């Protein structure tokens, strides 16, 4: 294995339209995080976290129950956006990926909140569909 | 095309169904050909290409 300099950063956008750039980064593994918060909260433009919740399990891979999609629309999204917090999970759609993703989607469709709940990912390089426009 | 707006915000608070984009588009056109702004405003607030 050899270690070289990395080739995909920068914006990101989808199809779908009335949003923004998301932002991604090829990164190595064995690497310090100090410049991963350095490239986050200074490059990219990102406030200090006031808390940090990450979110695991998924066993239910097609459909989540609707109590624990009550929880994870209302209970998690209103506090991370009330105290100001980073919901850390994994960026890919398996698992509870997609009931974060779709409670965030919820939550920011039903208020005028001036805001979203700032929902970082983190995916491995290899298990990315369409990694070749990157 | 009954111009209610609680069953179609409703319909989409349903995580069951996952639905596809060519619906939406469909529904989009029901919506711009005829006057109807709040489903055209809640449709692209659900995420869609144009």
Avoid: C
């Avoid at chain 1, 956008?13 to 100090?34: E, I, V, W």
């Avoid at chain 1, 006031?50 to 999204?77: C, E, H, K, Y």
């Amino acid at each position: 294995t050899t270690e070289k300099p990395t080739d995909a950063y920068g914006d990101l956008d989808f199809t779908y339209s009335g949003r923004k750039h998301s932002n991604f980064l090829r990164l190595s593994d064995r690497t310090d995080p100090a410049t991963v918060y350095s490239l986050v909260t200074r490059s990219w433009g990102f406030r200090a976290p006031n808390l940090v919740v990450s979110v695991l399990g998924g066993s239910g891979g097609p459909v989540l129950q609707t109590w624990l999609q009550d929880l994870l629309r209302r209970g998690l999204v209103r506090a991370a956006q009330s105290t100001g917090a980073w919901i850390v999970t994994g960026g890919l759609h398996t698992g509870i990926g997609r009931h974060v993703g779709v409670a965030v989607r919820d939550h920011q469709t039903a208020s005028t909140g001036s805001s979203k709940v700032v929902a970082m990912g983190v995916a491995p390089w290899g298990v990315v569909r369409n990694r070749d426009m990157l | 095309a009954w111009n209610r707006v609680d069953i179609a915000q409703s319909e989409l608070f349903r995580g069951d169904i996952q639905w596809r984009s060519f619906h939406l588009e469909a529904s989009l056109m029901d919506a711009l050909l005829n006057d109807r702004p709040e489903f055209v405003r809640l449709l692209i607030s659900h995420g869609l290409s144009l």
